[PDB]
């Protein structure tokens, strides 16, 4: 028998900063500062600066040393993490209830007072190589980075990871310039779980009144189209096929989200055949060896990418790509049942509700929402928003993918992997 839960509280300040808080009566507190500071805000002169920044969070600040941040956080058993998308950086901080003040102080120091001392920055440069190396052990990382580089002229084309030529070459000035033009009131959101709204509001008004930076969600992402190919002989070919879709929190994005679950996202059953996954069944029909297919769905501030991702044997890749693409074509041609949209609606709704079950998933959703929309949209109006997607909308999203200029990235033995014009 639980307590009747508190409502989330939400505040936009005149300077554009957004504060959102929830008092769950939990033993731990979670606090995030979400900043429109992701890799899309880099340009061709400063590539990788937001990677080194992501790695730089325990370097010395004004009255908190490197030693002090590490020791002080660890003394109370806390964490400090930094997570980045192409759009956002997110500085989050966890501890027990009683310890919020010290971790808040460390957070505000990291984000608004970093010193970027020449020698500390130097000792950190090799860490870019380690971090990139570890991430790029998953073939998916290569593919999705190449996919974005292929798709875009600009902004969203930039990698999450520093280009090799920039390792050792990103400077203290570039870090200072990056923080001073991106880490500003009108680009920030301060989210807190298990803190009071007055405490957060106070913290925001005292410590987070910055501006001398940029305004928009950027230089606008120009979708280009094209393909990037990486020879490996990796036994398996990873391919992704993609077209321009819809900006986040448009109605069309929900149509893409639902189509993604018609076609099939992740699995639901440990070791299952994926019976209601329409891409997986379509590939399974004419391919009798180990494979995978998922629908791919990446939505951004001013663009999106929808299509599918395949893993297959080198010789089978062409067949797997063609079976998958034909299955999408068949929904674009109108062969889509009302029960199939409804099951996809059920998977998406349940997926979203499970997404926000934990503190970590709740805070990230509230944080990104605050940056994308300027608002908090409760679970039941997200569910209402998903429900309003017509069958025709899902057909229309499939139509848009099939007719639209493609982007492709692939890696492996590519001797039987098709180019875009062969599809």
């Amino acid at each position: 028998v639980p307590p009747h839960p508190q409502d989330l509280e939400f505040t936009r300040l005149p300077n554009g900063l957004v504060i959102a808080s929830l008092e769950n009566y939990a033993p731990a507190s979670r606090i995030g500062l979400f900043i429109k500071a992701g890799s899309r805000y880099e340009n061709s002169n400063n590539l990788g600066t937001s990677h080194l920044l992501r790695l730089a969070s325990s370097l010395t600040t004004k009255g908190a040393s490197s030693f002090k941040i590490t020791r002080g956080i660890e003394a109370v058993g806390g964490k400090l993490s930094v997570t980045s998308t192409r759009e956002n950086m997110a500085y989050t901080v966890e501890c027990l209830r009683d310890d919020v003040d010290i971790l808040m102080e460390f957070l505000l120091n990291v984000t608004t007072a970093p010193e970027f001392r020449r020698w500390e920055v130097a000792a950190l440069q090799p860490q870019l190589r380690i971090d990139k190396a570890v991430a790029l052990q998953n073939p998916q990382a290569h593919v999705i980075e190449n996919l974005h580089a292929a798709a875009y002229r600009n902004a969203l084309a930039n990698s999450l990871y520093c280009p090799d030529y920039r390792i050792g070459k990103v400077t203290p000035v570039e870090l200072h310039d990056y923080v001073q033009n991106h880490f500003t009131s009108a680009r920030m959101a301060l989210i807190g779980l298990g803190v009071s709204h007055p405490v957060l509001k106070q913290v925001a008004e005292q410590f987070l009144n910055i501006r001398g930076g940029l305004g928009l969600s950027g230089a606008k992402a120009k979708y280009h189209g094209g393909e990037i190919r990486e020879q490996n002989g990796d036994s398996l070919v990873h391919a992704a096929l993609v077209a321009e879709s819809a900006a986040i929190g448009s109605a069309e994005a929900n149509a893409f989200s639902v189509l993604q679950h018609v076609l099939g996202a992740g699995p639901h059953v440990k070791r299952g055949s994926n019976a209601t996954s329409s891409l997986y069944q379509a590939v399974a029909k004419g391919v009798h060896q180990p494979f995978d297919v998922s629908a791919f769905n990446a939505s951004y501030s001013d663009s999106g990418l929808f299509g599918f991702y395949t893993i297959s044997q080198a010789a089978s890749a062409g067949d797997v790509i063609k079976a998958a693409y034909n299955q999408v074509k068949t929904i674009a041609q109108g062969n889509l049942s009302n029960p199939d949209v409804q099951a996809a609606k059920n998977k998406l709704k349940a997926g979203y509700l499970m997404s926000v079950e934990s503190s970590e998933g709740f805070l990230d959703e509230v944080g990104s929402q605050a940056l994308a929309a300027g608002s908090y949209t409760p679970p039941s109006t997200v569910l209402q928003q998903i429900d309003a997607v017509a069958d025709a909308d899902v057909i229309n999203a499939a139509k848009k993918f099939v007719s639209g200029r493609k982007s492709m990235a692939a890696s492996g033995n590519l001797g039987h992997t098709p180019f875009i014009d062969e599809l």
Binding site: P3, E23, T70, A75, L96, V134, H268, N274, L353
Partner: protein
């Protein structure tokens, strides 16, 4: 605002009921729109003999592939269609099947779980398909150096006991285990007093109880019969397995002394001490300044890629120690520094670092029990191991009691002058001789 202390009281009590066949049914209610439900069974590879080892693992492969009511793909079609997630795991001691679902879907989710447990339609052709799948999985697991060393450490620590065995079994078991072997396992082990229906989320305990009588009540109403089925203690050894492979680019080493079982109060202090030594890998921010002397020295002097401390619990025994991954020229230095930390904590642990370990454990415990799934696991697992749910405020009481004197007492008891089990895989020429590892388990100065 509430304190940390107040916040632990406000965590709602786990409600427990016993069904008439002896199935325990337990729930922690929150406000959530989603839930996790599942069956935790007191079954795993420690119950298996030489001849049927890997059977439960084989059952795990078959559990979702059809029932007497839902043949073939019909079950997964129902789970998928409501947007549910159906998952399973097998350890040496526990089997679990659980559904992540919408809270409004708890009726069907309980109905499916019962159908999986009671009515596994292990069709001969299906068991043949799974033969090749498990065999490939064994080939896959061979490439994971972490999974191999921990299997090796079990195989040497528990030498000639059922705890020496892998969960998956040997390959000869995989290729010769029949349907009759599998149904015999099911008959002996999937019995109502040995399994728990756990739930966490937006549910009343009353309806969890209702559905339990609805779908589980035909299990042990008169099936309480045959040798039901005593475990017996496993002799820990103190020994070494060294798989020398210089073709692999990094050495894996796991080292453990014999821990006490699930029951023992000593676990809380051991966990504090393990938190002080902590974990590390190469992607941790700020290395030099880390509090753990091992983690700090390992980062600065490039002594490893990763290490982790552990305390694996079984019934009346366990494995307490550490594992690491390092370059061929670093094993000696790693082992030296690891052992020195164990020795330091036995002899000369101090108040301040124990507070840090205490705090790390409160933060780990609370951060772990976050989501319907980990809470449901904890309800299920705890009722098998402790027979209660131990509430969050009790753990805090047990953590708070630990000071430097306790860490020195409890570490000395398990670590000081004890024979370790040691497992080595990879480029391990520089892995110290066992006598010299034994000698690292005491100090001449003390």
């Amino acid at each position: 605002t509430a304190t940390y202390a107040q916040a632990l009281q406000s965590v709602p009590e786990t409600q427990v009921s016993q069904l008439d066949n002896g199935l325990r049914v337990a729930s922690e209610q929150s406000s959530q729109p989603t839930c996790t439900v599942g069956v935790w069974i007191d079954a795993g590879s420690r119950y298996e003999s030489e001849k049927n080892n890997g059977a439960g693992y084989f059952v795990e492969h078959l559990a979702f592939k059809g029932t007497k009511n839902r043949p073939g793909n019909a079950l997964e079609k129902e789970v998928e269609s409501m947007g549910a997630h159906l998952n399973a795991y097998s350890t040496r001691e526990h089997t679990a099947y659980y559904i992540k679902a919408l809270s409004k879907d708890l009726p069907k989710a309980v109905e499916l779980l019962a159908d999986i447990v009671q009515n596994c339609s292990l069709e001969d052709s299906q068991i043949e398909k799974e033969r090749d799948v498990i065999l490939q999985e064994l080939q896959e697991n061979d490439t994971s150096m972490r999974d191999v060393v921990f299997n090796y450490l079990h195989a040497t620590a528990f030498q000639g006991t059922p705890l020496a065995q892998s969960v998956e079994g040997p390959s000869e078991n995989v290729r010769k285990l029949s349907r009759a072997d599998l149904t015999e396992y099911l008959s002996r082990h999937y019995k109502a007093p040995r399994m728990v229906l756990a739930a966490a989320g937006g549910l009343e305990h009353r309806q969890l109880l209702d559905l339990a009588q609805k779908h589980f009540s035909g299990l042990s109403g008169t099936y309480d019969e045959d040798a039901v089925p005593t475990l017996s203690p496993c002799r820990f050894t103190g020994s070494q397995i060294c798989h020398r492979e210089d073709g692999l680019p990094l050495a894996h080493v796991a080292i453990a002394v014999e821990g006490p079982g699930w029951a023992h109060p000593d676990n809380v202090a051991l966990q504090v001490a393990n938190a002080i030594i902590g974990h590390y890998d190469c992607t941790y921010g700020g290395g030099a300044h880390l509090s753990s002397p091992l983690a700090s020295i390992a980062a600065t002097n490039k002594l490893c890629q990763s290490f982790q401390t552990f305390n694996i619990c079984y019934a009346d025994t366990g494995l307490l120690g550490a594992h690491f991954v390092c370059d061929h020229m670093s094993i000696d230095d790693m082992m030296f520094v690891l052992q020195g930390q164990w020795m330091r904590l036995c002899t000369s642990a101090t108040e301040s670092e124990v507070l840090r370990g205490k705090n790390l454990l409160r933060n780990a415990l609370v951060s772990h029990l976050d989501g319907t799934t980990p809470v449901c696991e904890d309800i299920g697992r705890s009722l098998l191991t402790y027979g209660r749910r131990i509430p969050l405020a009790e753990w805090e009481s047990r953590i708070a009691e630990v000071d430097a004197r306790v860490v020195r007492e409890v570490c000395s008891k398990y670590f000081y002058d004890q024979c370790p089990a040691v497992a080595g895989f990879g480029p391990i020429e520089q892995l110290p001789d066992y006598n010299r590892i034994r000698s690292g388990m005491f100090w001449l100065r003390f």
